Each structure stands twice: as structure tokens, then as C-alpha cells.
Design a protein around this ligand. Structure first.
Ligand code: NA
Length: 129
């Protein structure tokens, strides 16, 4: 599923991401834009041999099991393919754990490099308040 921007904002809000660990909703929409281009099916193999999965590009070395990543810890206790669903629930539940770790949203490289320090409110322009 390729989400509309405001559609994803609504879905993320429904799941309580707005202001989760202090990160306003625009941060989460911005992250998803630059991590997956709002595409739940997005997968990207990493140089390290892990793969990033879904709307928020959750990694197979630490967070989910994809059956092919050496050193997999599976801290979210989920198959990585579950993170590709049109239903973002599993991705959100795992993101909540991820963002609760020491570095916060800095774990998402696209957030750190493209969203952090910018006017992230722009990413929810037009979306129901
Ligand atoms: Na992999």
C-alpha cells in the first residue's frame, strides 16, 4: 500500500504516535516519507547484510526476523514480512520500542539526516487536526 500523506498521518495518530516520546506527528510522517516514500512494501538490503522493512524501514539485525540476517536479535519478536502489511499496527508497535531506546528517532537515518531540525509541521499540512 502506498499511503496518502494525510492518510498515514491519521493512521499514525490513531496508534498514538503523535508526541510519542515527545516526537510530534510531523516527525513520524517526515520519517516515513524519506524512509519508505509512504510505501508499506518498501524493502532495502543494507551493506551489512540486514534488510530494512516497511513504512518505517525496521531492520532485521535488531528488530525483526527475516530468516537470512546473521546475528538477528528480533527484539520486536515479529517476522519482518509482518512489517510490510497494509496494516501499519506491527510497524508502529515495533517503532514505539525502537524510539524508546537510547537514541530516540536518531535510529532512523532518514529522520536524522532529512527531518531533524527542519519544519516537520509541513508534513501534516492539510491533514485533519
Ligand atoms: Na536481510
Amino acid at each position: 500500500k502506498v499511503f496518502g500523506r494525510c492518510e498515514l498521518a491519521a493512521a499514525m495518530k490513531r496508534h498514538g504516535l503523535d508526541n510519542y516520546r515527545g516526537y510530534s506527528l510531523g516527525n513520524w510522517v517526515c520519517a516515513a516519507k524519506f524512509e519508505s516514500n509512504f510505501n508499506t512494501q518498501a524493502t532495502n538490503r543494507n551493506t551489512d547484510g540486514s534488510t530494512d522493512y516497511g513504512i518505517l524501514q525496521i531492520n532485521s539485525r535488531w528488530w525483526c526476523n527475516d530468516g537470512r540476517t546473521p546475528g538477528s536479535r528480533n527484539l520486536c519478536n515479529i517476522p519482518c514480512s509482518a512489517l510490510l502489511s497494509s496494516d501499519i499496527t506491527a510497524s508502529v508497535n515495533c517503532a514505539k520500542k525502537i524510539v524508546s531506546d537510547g537514541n530516540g528517532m536518531n535510529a532512523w537515518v532518514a529522520w536524522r539526516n532529512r527531518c531533524k531540525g527542519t519544519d516537520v509541521q509541513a508534513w501534516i499540512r492539510g491533514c485533519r487536526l
